[PDB]
Structures are given as C-alpha cells and as structure tokens.
Structure 1
Amino acid sequence: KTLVHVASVEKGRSYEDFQKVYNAIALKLREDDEYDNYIGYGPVLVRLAWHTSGTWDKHDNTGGSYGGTYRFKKEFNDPSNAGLQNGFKFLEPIHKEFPWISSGDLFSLGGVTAVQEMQGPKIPWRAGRVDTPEDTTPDNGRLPDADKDADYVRTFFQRLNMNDREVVALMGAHALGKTHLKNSGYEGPWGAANNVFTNEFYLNLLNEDWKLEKNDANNEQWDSKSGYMMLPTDYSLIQDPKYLSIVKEYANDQDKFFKDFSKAFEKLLENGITFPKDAPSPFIFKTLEEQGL
C-alpha cells in the first residue's frame, strides 16, 4: 500500500510568482539584520529547510518536506527543532503575503533563498508540495543526534538516500550560524564568517587545533582557542578515512563544494516527492543583487 506524494503546483503559479516569494524572503532577510547578534536570519532558515525535510524515511515514505507538517505542535515542539520557531516567525508575514503557497514550498524555499542570498551556490527548486493533515506528522526523534561518530553519521544519512559525498557536502552548511546552548546544549560557531556561505567549515576542521572539552551543559564538544567549535558528528568527518578525503577536497576547492552542495540540498528538499513527467523543470531564482534590488 505504498504512500505516494504527487507534486501539485499551486494553481496558475509559475516562475514569476515564486520569484516574488523569493524576493520577499530576501528583502526581509536583508532588513532584519539584527537577529541573533547580527548573524541575521539566513542560518536558521537553512536549518528549518533541512529539519522540515530531514524527517523523511525512505523505507515507507513517512515524513519529508511535502506535507509541511512542522506547522503542527508535535513537530514544532520536537526537542531537535528548538530554535527553529524563530524561522517560522520570520516566515509568518511572508505566508500572510502569499496565502496561496503551501507550507512545504515555503519552508523549503526559505532555505534556498537564504543559501543564495548568503552568496552560496544557486540551488534549483521545484514547487508543488501540498499540505497534509495533522495525523501525517512524523513523531519526534527522526533528526540526527550530535553526540555521535562517523558510523552513526553514515548510517543515519542512508535513511535520506545520501551517500558519503552528499553527507560531507551537506554538512558544510555548518559554515553558517552557530550552536546555542539553550537550543541544543552546544555553544559556539564553526567559523568567523557566520552569514556568508563558503567552505570555511572544511578549512577550520582541518586547520584549527581542536581540543575535546565539556561545555556548560556538560556535553563534550571540540573547541579551538580561536573560539570556534565542532560537534562530535562534525569532527567525525576527519576521523573517518573516506570522509576525510572529501573534507580535503572541499577545503581545496570551493567551486566543487558548491556544486555538490547544490545537488545534495535540492535532493534533500525533494526526497519523497513524485514529480509528474509533465512537471515544469526546476526553477533557478535570481538573487536580489542580480535583479539590482
């Protein structure tokens, strides 16, 4: 009886509609620059996009981006999602402006927009996620644990159909934002340039002196005298041989990182969705800069 989610584009809407949504997100992003000690909303939007998609279980097609289930308390209150309320609040006036867009399309698009506006690669995006009822909300506990090793990481990501390159690439989003002790019981940034999408995560992982320390919540994290940190799952990418080869590649070649990220993150945001052969081809949105806005 396999669960299928057929993409169904918002009626009569096409590239130009979605570009305005993008632009409205991007303008708010630039405007609300104070958030989180001037990091701004970009990182938390990227996190929200990933956590709304990252509930997918490839084996029965439960969870995933399609239903926009994060709007329900059960998922909204997942301990793994603490802090993401801020991204939901950011998007609230955008949803009021475009009541025709689905929640899944909005959450996923917010991530794409944030990555591009922070000068990351272009990320093609497809519309047609359709909201599903409250009883379709996946239970808490599907998102990954930080206090883990490389074997956990690799097997965790297999459930999202991601291979070694996809995993190392996707993790590079940790160039963005920071850990906040009140949210996750980890504290600190992975790098200096918190709101610009670069390969700094890979360069820091290889080049800083990391020391294993207990933080104020008594979790262990890898710390640099520089004031940066790595979660145990991040440091895992250099303890594992096959992971470390890819970290070195990305550290040496940002263009390659960008390409691989773009693919993996689209794939992430599209897992579990069946697109009719009919469907339009992926949309690639212009940045505010490119539009001269």
Structure 2
Amino acid sequence: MITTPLVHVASVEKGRSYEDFQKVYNAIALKLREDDEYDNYIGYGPVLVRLAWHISGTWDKHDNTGGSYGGTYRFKKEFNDPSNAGLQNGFKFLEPIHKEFPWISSGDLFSLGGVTAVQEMQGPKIPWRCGRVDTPEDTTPDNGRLPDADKDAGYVRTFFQRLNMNDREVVALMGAHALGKTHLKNSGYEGPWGAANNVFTNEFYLNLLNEDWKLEKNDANNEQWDSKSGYMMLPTDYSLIQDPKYLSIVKEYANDQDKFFKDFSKAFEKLLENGITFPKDAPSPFIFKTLEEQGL
C-alpha cells in the first residue's frame, strides 16, 4: 500500500471564538505571574516554550506524522520519551487550566502555552490558529524524532530539513535559548545560556559572539562550551558560529533585535502549524493581547 501523507484538517472547537481563546491566554498568563518560584525564580515561561517546541518537533514532512495537531504528548509513550525529560513540569502547570477550559484540545492548549509564554516574557506577538483535534493513542509517534545536542552544524541543517525549515528559520528558532537553562538531571548538560533567563531578547546571539568559550567536560561526562561569565552553549548552539552560513545570520540578529523578533515570530508560528490543513473558511490567525495591554 502506498504511503500518502495523511491530511489533518483543523476544526474549530464548537462555538468558540477569539474571546474564548483570549480567556485561556489570560489564565495561562496570570498563572505565569503568580507561580513565580519555579526553577529558582525563573518561572514556568521557558519550560512552556520548550513544551510547545517538543510537541511540534516530532513532525515528519514526508508522511505528515507527528507534529502539534494530535496532542499526543498526553500519552505515555510520548510523555516518557527521554528527550522530553523535564517537560512534565510544564504539563502539570497546564493541567488546572485544561480543567477550567475543558473544551480546548490538547494540541491547542500546548501550543497556546508557548505563544503566551513568549508574549508575557516581552517577546514578539505570535499569531496563533486554533483547531487542532486530539487523535487517539495509536497515532503517537515513536520516540527518537527530537534532535540530539551533541552534534554539529551539518546535523542541525539536515535535522531541520525534516521540519521544512531553512537556515534563517533555524537560526531564528534557536534564539529561544535565551530562555531558561539546561538541567543536568534532564539532559546531561548544566547551566544557563545568559543572564536574563526569563525575558525574551537577542542575548543568545550576543553571548555567542562576545564571550570566550572553552570546551569542557561536565559532571555527566558530556562536553559543553563554557564561558568565564558562567554561561554555557550546547555543541549544537556553538555550531551556529562554526558554520559560515549560520554565522552570517547570527551576526544579523546580534545587531538587530527587531529583525530577530520578526523572523522568530514567523518561524515559531510555522513550527506550531506544520502538518495542519486549515480550511478555506477557517478564521484568520488570532493576535492575543498581553496582560499589560489589558490592564490586568
């Protein structure tokens, strides 16, 4: 039998519109503000961004398996992927919000969590479309589709071809490593990429270019790039300035945060929408207001 790419058609949750989704955004954003202690006062923002990326990064363009549509991270096989270690904290953050808004699909909730986190950490607006539909447990992708960190630029470039991302999209997406940190017990790496861990800036590119990096072994026997300031870079991060095509784009975003914000917004929306067919009568993407813009 011929493997044709499955078609996943978006279906708006019955009788819901912009205001219903803005209500869910606000609930996420208010909990982000109130549960501020997590991970030594970094807050949940970074882990929600990582969650939105990991539920989307399983996509394979060749057969349209994986991706954010089906919300399959809720199932044990994907929940327990070693590559997803640490994301359970993001899932538990969202669980009460799902109980307050039971009508939203899992893929819509997980992807909206990442959009809300970016915007509430003062990043760019990210347009967002609803209509992901929960699919059954047999549609869960096998473990092993997410990328390894102990690799070089050629691996990064060919990995992201599977997600239909080009060099600029890859470099823009990687700027999310301004946020949060690596945790030895989750991934075998330890340390933050920069100082402003929970504000969305172009700091990742500035640190890449301006710090003095040294390759060192960490307590898990892996090698990572460390600077005297106490920052770290993964081998795949540092590959962005070893490769001359990636380096040109790193320099662009280090010098113009506005360009970075624009390109990141487009690439992050594309990541979250890969694999989904939106009907012709589907609503336009929503742009949610921040809590600040609402006076909340």
1:161-176 equivalences under 5 Å are 161-176=164-179
User: What is the alpha-carbon distance in structure 2 between the residues aligned to residue 78 and residue 291 of structure 1?
Assistant: 38
- Runs in 1 of length 4+ with deviation above 6 angstroms? none
TM-score, normalised to structure 2's length? 0.98
3-state SS, counterpart of residue 223 of structure 1: strand
- In the alignment of these two chains, the number of paired residues is 291
3-state SS, counterpart of residue 227 of structure 1: coil
Cα deviation digits, residues 208-250 of structure 1 (max 9, x gap): 0000000000000000010000000000000000000000000
User: What is the alpha-carbon distance in structure 1 between the residues aligned to residue 228 and residue 284 of structure 2?
Assistant: 47
3-state SS, counterpart of residue 202 of structure 1: helix
Deviation at 1:267, TM superposition (A): 0.2
Deviation at 1:58, TM superposition (A): 0.2
User: What is the alpha-carbon distance in structure 2 between the residues aligned to residue 204 and residue 258 of structure 1?
Assistant: 17
Unaligned runs of 5+ in 2: 1-5
Deviation at 1:15, TM superposition (A): 0.4
Of 273, 276, 279 in structure 1, the residue corresponding to residue 279 of structure 2 is 276
User: What is the alpha-carbon distance in structure 2 between the residues aligned to residue 290 and residue 218 of structure 1?
Assistant: 46
Deviation at 1:156, TM superposition (A): 0.2
User: What is the alpha-carbon distance in structure 1 between the residues aligned to residue 282 and residue 13 of structure 2?
Assistant: 12
Cα deviation digits, residues 244-284 of structure 1 (max 9, x gap): 00000000000000000000000000000000011000000
1:58 aligns with 2:58: no
After superposition, the CA RMSD in angstroms is 0.3
User: What is the alpha-carbon distance in structure 2 between the residues aligned to residue 158 and residue 16 of structure 1?
Assistant: 36
Q: Residue 119 of structure 1 aligns with which residue? A: 122
User: What is the alpha-carbon distance in structure 1 between the residues aligned to residue 154 and residue 30 of structure 2?
Assistant: 41
Unaligned runs of 5+ in 1: none
Cα deviation digits, residues 91-133 of structure 1 (max 9, x gap): 0000000000000000000000000000000000000000000
TM-score, normalised to structure 1's length? 0.99
User: What is the alpha-carbon distance in structure 2 between the residues aligned to residue 18 and residue 277 of structure 1?
Assistant: 21
Of 140, 153, 170 in structure 2, the residue corresponding to residue 137 of structure 1 is 140
User: What is the alpha-carbon distance in structure 1 between the residues aligned to residue 17 and residue 219 of structure 2?
Assistant: 49
User: What is the alpha-carbon distance in structure 1 between the residues aligned to residue 181 and residue 280 of structure 2?
Assistant: 40
User: What is the alpha-carbon distance in structure 1 between the residues aligned to residue 121 and residue 157 of structure 2?
Assistant: 28
3-state SS, counterpart of residue 225 of structure 2: strand
User: What is the alpha-carbon distance in structure 1 between the residues aligned to residue 293 and residue 96 of structure 2?
Assistant: 24
Q: Residue 35 of structure 2 aligns with which residue? A: 32
User: What is the alpha-carbon distance in structure 2 between the residues aligned to residue 292 and residue 182 of structure 1?
Assistant: 39
Deviation at 1:176, TM superposition (A): 0.1
Cα deviation digits, residues 67-101 of structure 1 (max 9, x gap): 00000000000000000000000000000000000
User: What is the alpha-carbon distance in structure 1 between the residues aligned to residue 240 and residue 33 of structure 2?
Assistant: 33
3-state SS, counterpart of residue 155 of structure 1: helix
